[model samples]
Target: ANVEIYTKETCPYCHRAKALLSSKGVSFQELPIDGNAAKREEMIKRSGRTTVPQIFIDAQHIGGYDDLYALDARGGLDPLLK
Candidate 1:
């Protein structure tokens, strides 16, 4: 149940992504990359994308907020949680 979300302060998409996780009662580690080049670099290297709200579940790259939402919408998220 290890979930990680790469985010930045003031990013609405990041906020919405967090809200979705919260509604699912999922505890996640938030890695905020605001004003930190090192953190941002790590996110980019891990996700291979320059975007906030990148998500990973158990080290599996689940992509961005939209991708996460789509996974849940199709009922894939619950299985991963278990």
Candidate 2:
């Protein structure tokens, strides 16, 4: 399973997103965009959003924390965890 999460410091949603993943016993790569212009630009470029907690599962952009939560609630997230 390949999970990449782009986040910024002081973001509550980022913590929620990471916590959810952790609860699922998943290990994700965290990319903090705070004070990093290149990473911030890359996050915006790849996610098409200026928000934190941008998630990617196997290179698929899965939007933010809410989107991830919705996906999990609908039972669409476990399959990707494999």
- Tens digit of lDDT per residue, candidate 1, span 6-68? 888788878888899889887788987878888788877788896877899888888888988
| Cα lDDT of model 2 by residue, 1-82, tens digit | 8889988879899999899988998878999877898878887778898688888988899988999999899998889875
TM-score for candidate 2, please give it: 0.91
Q: Which residue ranges in model 1 land beyond 4 Å of their true spot?
A: none
Give the C-alpha miss distance for residue 57 in model 1, angstroms: 1.4
Provide the lDDT at 64 for model 2: 88
For model 2 the local lDDT of residue 9 reads 70
Of candidate 2, the 10-residue stretch with the lowest lDDT total is 38-47
Clashes of 2: 0
The C-alpha lDDT values of all candidates are 0.84, 0.87
